[PDB]
Design a binder for these strands. Structure first.
Lengths: 120, 64, 52, 93, 104
RNA sequence: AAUAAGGAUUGACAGAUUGAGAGCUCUUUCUUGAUUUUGUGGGUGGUGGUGCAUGGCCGUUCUUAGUUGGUGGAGUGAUUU
């Protein structure tokens, strides 16, 4: 029970939905292209968690709801991601917010994100 | 004579040039280039008499 | 971009060899558009035996 | 070289696919035959792939002939996310 | 039974496949007995590309005259949509071009 | 790596300037918008050299009569007719 925030962020990276890291996410957040807010609350500010929290507090549709608390868990899951490794030879950076642009999949653990999303 | 050194690709390392409000609503400041490209975001930057837009390289002329 | 390519239609530099890609020596004579040292070379094959 | 994630993906695409590409030495072209990806593009991104041996160039007549590499076409199988059914023009009697 | 007055127009670089085809032509058509003429035989064009021999001014002034001599060659032939097609398909070959500039 | 969305930088009227309706410069201070600019690393512009670093071709001995080899056979052999 993160196993369902590896099979729906693996699929949107791979499809190139996403965006990654401020800038591309609240440009994604304010415009109706981009359906989720899953992020760091270990921000080293407080206006990036009431920025991304206001954009989920824009309400038509696209309900952005929060799940993880972290930037180095999230250089792996997202994937930027070196090769022949184990789980990090990679970036060691933080893709912090990964905003869902319709993804690139349909059903297996993407139907438990549309019973723990909204049933909270 | 003389070499340049290429312009710095420079570090506003964060952003927030968009009324961060207190508590629970974010909105959008300095217009948002009145074009479709220029879509919803595009945080207009302030130069000589006419304002300045980068989704289109930069361009655009809408006062302030 | 004016600021990488110029006004090259007519002259010598415009058209260039088929085989080697040189400007020097040209055989325009009959949709040929080669150079005028190579030609000969193959040619004897290509058509151009001889009869002299 | 610094390219584009809708031309980097597009090549390594009628490269696997037909499998086999035959893209002239005319730098200075909008556009290559069968790929919108100006010309000059290819030629140079393929000077890269060749260089590893996921591919194999042959020269002369002035076109750069390329043509697949039996395996290295199992790299394109993971890059443009696709089966592990097909072999690409490959098995076609 | 719709009749058509075809015209048969040939060209090659060998006088030996070519002559072969209005012997086969006008006797794979007098088998058919067709109303035709006899292999008309057109002025011999005949290109002489002067070129010097050397790779470099040097070196005497040391020249060539290679050329293709075609033998242009045409024909005739009536016959419907059926027995000009069974004739054009047959003569079938190395060295040679056949047009059927049709006369409906 | 540095300038650092607090503007890297771009552009221009017309007038000063010149051949000139090149904003080449400077006057103004609009526009400009992370694509640039600066050093560091390095490239690629080259009808600049070197034909004696060379490729390819073309001149010359050449509207030439001339090479070379087997098996014999000859003649340490450099070999020969």
């Amino acid at each position: 029970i993160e196993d369902a925030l590896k099979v729906v962020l693996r699929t949107a990276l791979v499809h190139d939905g996403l965006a990654r890291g401020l800038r591309e996410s609240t440009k994604a957040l304010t415009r109706g292209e981009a359906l989720l807010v899953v992020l760091v609350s270990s921000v080293t500010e407080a206006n990036i968690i009431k920025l991304v929290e206001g954009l989920a507090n824009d309400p038509e549709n696209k309900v952005p709801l929060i799940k993880v608390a972290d930037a180095k868990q999230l250089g792996e899951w997202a994937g930027l991601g070196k090769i022949d490794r184990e789980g990090n030879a990679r970036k060691v950076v933080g893709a912090s917010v990964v905003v869902v642009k319709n993804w690139g999949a349909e059903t297996d653990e993407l139907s438990m994100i549309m019973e723990h999303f909204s049933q909270q | 004579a003389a070499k340049k050194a290429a312009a710095a690709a420079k570090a506003a390392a964060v952003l927030s040039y968009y009324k961060v409000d207190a508590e629970g609503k974010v909105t959008k400041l300095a217009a948002a280039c009145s074009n479709p490209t220029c879509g919803a975001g595009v945080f207009l930057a302030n130069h000589k008499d006419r304002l300045y837009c980068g989704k289109c390289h930069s361009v655009y002329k809408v006062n302030a | 971009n004016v600021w990488f390519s110029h006004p090259r239609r007519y002259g010598k530099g415009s058209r260039q060899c088929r085989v080697c890609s040189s400007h020097t020596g040209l055989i325009r004579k009959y949709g040929l558009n080669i150079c005028r040292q190579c030609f000969r070379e193959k040619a004897n094959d290509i058509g151009f035996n001889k009869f002299r | 070289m610094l390219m584009p994630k809708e031309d980097r993906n597009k090549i390594h695409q009628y490269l696997f696919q037909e499998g086999v590409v035959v893209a002239k030495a005319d730098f200075n072209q909008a556009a290559h035959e069968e790929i919108d990806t100006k010309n000059l593009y290819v030629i140079k991104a393929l000077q890269s792939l060749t260089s590893k041996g996921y591919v194999k160039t042959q020269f002369s007549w002035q076109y750069y002939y390329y043509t697949l590499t039996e395996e290295g076409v199992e790299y394109l199988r993971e890059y443009l996310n696709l089966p592990e059914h097909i072999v690409p023009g490959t098995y076609i009697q | 039974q719709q009749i058509i007055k075809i015209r048969i127009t040939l060209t090659s670089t060998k006088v030996k496949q070519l002559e072969n085809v209005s012997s086969n032509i006008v006797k794979n058509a007098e088998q058919h007995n067709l109303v035709k003429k006899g292999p008309v035989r057109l002025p011999t064009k005949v290109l002489k590309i002067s070129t010097r021999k050397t790779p470099n001014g040097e070196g005497s002034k040391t020249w060539e005259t290679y050329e293709m001599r075609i033998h242009k060659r045409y024909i005739d032939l009536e016959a419907p949509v059926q027995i000009v097609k069974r004739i054009t398909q047959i003569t079938i070959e190395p060295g040679v071009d056949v047009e059927v500039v049709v006369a409906s």
